[PDB]
Point group: C3
Chain length 45, copies 3
Amino acid sequence: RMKQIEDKIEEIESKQKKIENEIARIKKLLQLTVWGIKQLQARIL
Amino acid sequence: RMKQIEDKIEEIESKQKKIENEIARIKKLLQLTVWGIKQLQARIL
Amino acid sequence: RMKQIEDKIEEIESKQKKIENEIARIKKLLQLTVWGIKQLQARIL
Ligand SMILES: [Cl-]
Ligand SMILES: [Cl-]
Ligand SMILES: [Cl-]
Ligand SMILES: [Cl-]
């Protein structure tokens, strides 16, 4: 039962690192959409 | 104690599932705003 | 062994809280980026 607990934890940690990666990539794309909007803003103004 | 550990792990998994679901919604919204901005770019440039 | 399990759970929940905080921030920034887009649209059209 402790083995089963340990294996579930290791799976949880692994899925959590993939969420951290996904969030990191999201923030990079978001920073680029923000830069794109400010570019357009500069132009129409 | 193992009961308390098992309960904690099932809340963490539950919460991690809802994080994954919010991350998918964020990616779709992000995809929509990248497209909206591309629509502006083609019309403004 | 059970202490190491508990410790790891506490590490995982702490990271989860920080992830949730990142998701909420990213959602706000996204809402603002969408607003900025809809403003440019209304101005252009
Ligand atoms: Cl065991
Ligand atoms: Cl998580
Ligand atoms: Cl027990
Ligand atoms: Cl112990």
